[PDB]
């Protein structure tokens, strides 16, 4: 198991514009396109992201290219963030994957906001961090995915994904 396979399980793959869990226009492997209600606005971002007229449909390779960019950007946003960088550096490889997954789903700012949980992770207080991460809109809106991420921080293994 690695970050790519982990997110591929959590996001799925869809080759046609669809609406995510919050109602936003998405495509490929969890690639948010626009928060706007406009499908046309979504088609527009999509063609710009791909470099061709897609008419809302992309191929497998294109989906995979967007995904690789987004994982790269997630890692780099973590490394550039004053709040996230220290947490990441302190973690083992499995747990680092779990922080990357949260960043990919909720963005850097969002994650930076879990102040208390972050401090707890840093301190390696596993059970405590798992209890605090659960008290969030995040866990309430996407509980199965949240539980998976949470198990990963609690245990340090890929168990929840196997
Ligand atoms: Cl993009
Ligand atoms: Cl879920």
From Swiss-Prot:
The keyword Phosphoprotein does not apply. The keyword Transcription regulation does not apply. It catalyses: Hydrolysis of (1->4)-beta-linkages between N-acetylmuramic acid and N-acetyl-D-glucosamine residues in a peptidoglycan and between N-acetyl-D-glucosamine residues in chitodextrins. InterPro entries: Endolysin_T4_type, Glyco_hydro_24, Lysozyme-like_dom_sf, Lysozyme_dom_sf, Phage_lysozyme-like, T4-type_lysozyme. Its main location: host cell. The active site is at 11 (proton donor/acceptor), 20 (proton donor/acceptor). It is found in: Host cytoplasm. Substrate binds at residues 32, 104, 117, 132. GO terms for biological process: cell wall macromolecule catabolic process; defense response to bacterium; peptidoglycan catabolic process; viral release from host cell by cytolysis. One of its GO terms (cellular component) is host cell cytoplasm. Keywords: Antimicrobial, Bacteriolytic enzyme, Cytolysis, Glycosidase, Host cell lysis by virus, Host cytoplasm, Hydrolase, Viral release from host cell. Changing residue 117 to F: 10-fold decrease in enzymatic activity. It holds the Pfam family Phage_lysozyme. One of its GO terms (molecular function) is lysozyme activity. Induction: Expressed late in the viral replication. Optimum pH is 7.3. Its EC number is 3.2.1.17. Belongs to the glycosyl hydrolase 24 family. Endolysin with lysozyme activity that degrades host peptidoglycans and participates with the holin and spanin proteins in the sequential events which lead to the programmed host cell lysis releasing the mature viral particles. Once the holin has permeabilized the host cell membrane, the endolysin can reach the periplasm and break down the peptidoglycan layer. HAMAP family: ENDOLYSIN_T4. This is Endolysin. It comes from Enterobacteria phage T4 (Bacteriophage T4).
């Amino acid at each position: 198991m690695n970050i790519f396979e982990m997110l591929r399980i959590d996001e799925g793959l869809r080759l046609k514009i669809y609406k995510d869990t919050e109602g936003y226009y998405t495509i490929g492997i969890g690639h948010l396109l626009t928060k706007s209600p406009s499908l046309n606005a979504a088609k527009s971002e999509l063609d710009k992201a791909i470099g061709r007229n897609t008419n809302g449909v992309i191929t497998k390779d294109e989906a995979e290219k967007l995904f690789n960019q987004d994982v790269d950007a997630a890692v780099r946003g973590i490394l550039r963030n004053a709040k996230l960088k220290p947490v990441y550096d302190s973690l083992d490889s499995v747990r680092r994957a779990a922080l990357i997954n949260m960043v990919f789903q909720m963005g850097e700012t969002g994650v930076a906001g879990f102040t208390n949980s972050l401090r707890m992770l840093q301190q390696k207080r596993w059970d405590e961090a798992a209890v605090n991460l659960a008290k969030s809109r995040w866990y309430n809106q996407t509980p199965n995915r949240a539980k998976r991420v949470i198990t990963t921080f609690r245990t340090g293994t890929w168990d929840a994904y196997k």
